C-alpha cells in the first residue's frame, strides 16, 4: 500500500477540510441526497416522534481530490475517513431530540475524478404531528427533512438521489418490517426556497398505516 500512502500524502498536502470545494469563487457544490430505510423502529404517539434507522446516501464532487490513476499504480478509488475530507453539513432539520448528525462517520469513497460518495448510518428521531382523529385505524404522514445547516442555496445545491427513483430505498430481503405499521408511500422531494440565506430541502415522506389487530382484540 505504499502507492496508496504516497497518493494519500499528495492528496492531503495543502488540503483544508473546512473549506467548501468550489472550483472557482461563486461556484456551487451539487449534493445529491438519498435515503435507505433499514428499520422503521417506531412511531411514539405520546412523544409524537418517529424513530428510524437509515443509511444516508450523499454524493458530491470535490475537485481537490482528483488524481490520474496512471501516475499512482492504477489506483482508481480510495476509502478515506470522513473527518479527513470536507463534508456537506447535511442534517435532519426536523429532529425531535436535538440530535442533528449521523450515528457513525464511517468512511467516504473517493473516485479519481473527485467524485465522493458517503453512506453513513443514522438513528433518527424525527418530529411527526399525529393525526389522532381515527386512531387506532389511522394513517400518519411522517417527514424527514434533510438540508444543509449552514450553507445557502448559492453555495450547496441539493438534489434527490436517483441513478433511479425519487423514493426512500427499501431492500426487500433485508428490511426489518414493523409489526405495527405498513408503508403505503415513500416518496422524496426537493423543496426549493420561495422565489441570500435561502436554503433548499430534501424531504423523505413516509405515509404509514397502523395495523390495529391489537386494539380490535383488546
Amino acid at each position: 500500500s505504499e502507492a496508496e500512502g504516497r497518493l494519500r500524502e499528495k492528496l492531503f498536502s495543502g488540503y483544508d477540510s473546512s473549506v467548501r470545494p468550489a472550483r472557482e469563487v461563486g461556484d456551487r457544490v451539487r449534493v445529491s441526497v438519498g435515503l435507505i430505510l433499514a428499520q422503521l423502529i417506531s412511531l411514539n404517539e405520546k412523544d409524537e416522534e418517529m424513530s428510524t434507522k437509515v443509511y444516508l446516501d450523499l454524493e458530491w464532487t470535490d475537485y481537490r481530490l482528483s488524481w490520474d490513476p496512471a501516475e499512482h499504480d492504477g489506483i482508481d478509488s480510495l476509502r478515506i475517513t470522513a473527518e479527513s475530507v470536507w463534508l456537506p453539513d447535511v442534517v435532519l432539520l426536523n429532529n425531535n431530540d436535538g440530535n442533528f448528525d449521523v450515528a457513525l462517520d464511517i468512511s467516504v469513497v473517493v473516485s479519481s475524478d473527485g467524485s465522493v460518495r458517503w453512506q453513513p448510518p443514522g438513528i433518527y428521531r424525527s418530529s411527526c404531528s399525529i393525526q389522532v382523529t381515527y386512531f387506532p385505524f389511522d394513517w400518519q404522514n411522517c417527514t424527514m427533512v434533510f438540508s444543509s445547516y449552514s450553507y445557502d442555496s448559492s453555495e450547496v445545491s441539493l438534489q434527490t438521489g436517483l441513478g433511479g427513483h425519487q423514493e426512500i430505498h427499501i431492500h426487500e430481503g433485508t428490511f426489518i418490517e414493523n409489526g405495527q405499521w405498513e408503508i403505503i408511500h415513500k416518496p422524496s422531494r426537493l423543496i426549493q426556497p420561495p422565489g441570500e440565506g435561502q436554503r433548499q430541502e430534501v424531504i423523505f415522506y413516509l405515509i404509514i398505516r397502523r395495523k390495529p389487530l391489537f386494539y380490535l382484540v383488546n
Partner: antibody
Amino acid sequence: QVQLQESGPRLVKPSQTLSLTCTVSGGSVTRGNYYWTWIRQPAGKELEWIGHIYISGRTNFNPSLKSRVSISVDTSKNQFSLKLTSVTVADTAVYYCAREREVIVDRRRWLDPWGQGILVTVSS
Amino acid sequence: IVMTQSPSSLSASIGDRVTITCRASHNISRYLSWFQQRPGKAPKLLIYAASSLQSGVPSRFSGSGSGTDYTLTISNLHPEDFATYFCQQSYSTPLIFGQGTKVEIKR
C-alpha cells in the same frame, strides 16, 4: 467506460441557429471534475475549441465566437447542448463533443474521450 | 497563447524516425497533448501531460519537453503511422490546437 454521441440537424441555413446535442452514456454530466467541451474542425484546417461547460453550470467560450455561442447542460437526459446563432458559410465543420478531465494532484488536464463527430454544413 | 507546430509537413519511410516540435508563446506547465488524426476520422489522443502515454497506444510514440518547448518522437515508424499530428495546450482557456503536421510515405 463513458461514451459521447453527437446529434442534431446535418444541414442548417445561414443566419439561423445551429443546434447540437451531445448525449453521455456511462457517466453523469454533473458528477466528477470534468469540463464538457465543444470543438470544431472545418474540413482541411485546424481544430477550433468552441467552448465548455463545467459541472457546476459555469461556461467558458472562445473569444472569437463569444457573442454567438451558448452551451447548456440537461441533467435529466444526461446531455449537453451547443447553440450558435447567426451562422455563416464559414461555420461549416465537423463538430466534436468531448470530456476534458482535470486532476489536481498530478496537475493535468486532457481531453478524453472524444465524440465520433457530426458534419454540419451551412447552406441555403 | 499561440502554438507554433513545426514542420508543417514531413516525409518519412517505414522504419525511420519522426520528430515534431510544438513551441508555445507562453510558459506551459506541461499542459500539452499530442493527437493523431487519420483522414476522415476523429482526432485520437496519443500523449497527454507532455510525457504520459495514453492507454492502447504503441510505446514507439514518445512525448517530451517542458516550459515552452515540446517534442513528439515516432521511432521505428509503421505503415499505420502516416497521419496528421496535432499539439493541443490546456494551460489556459481558450484551448489552442497546433497547425497540424502531416507525415506521409517518402518515395
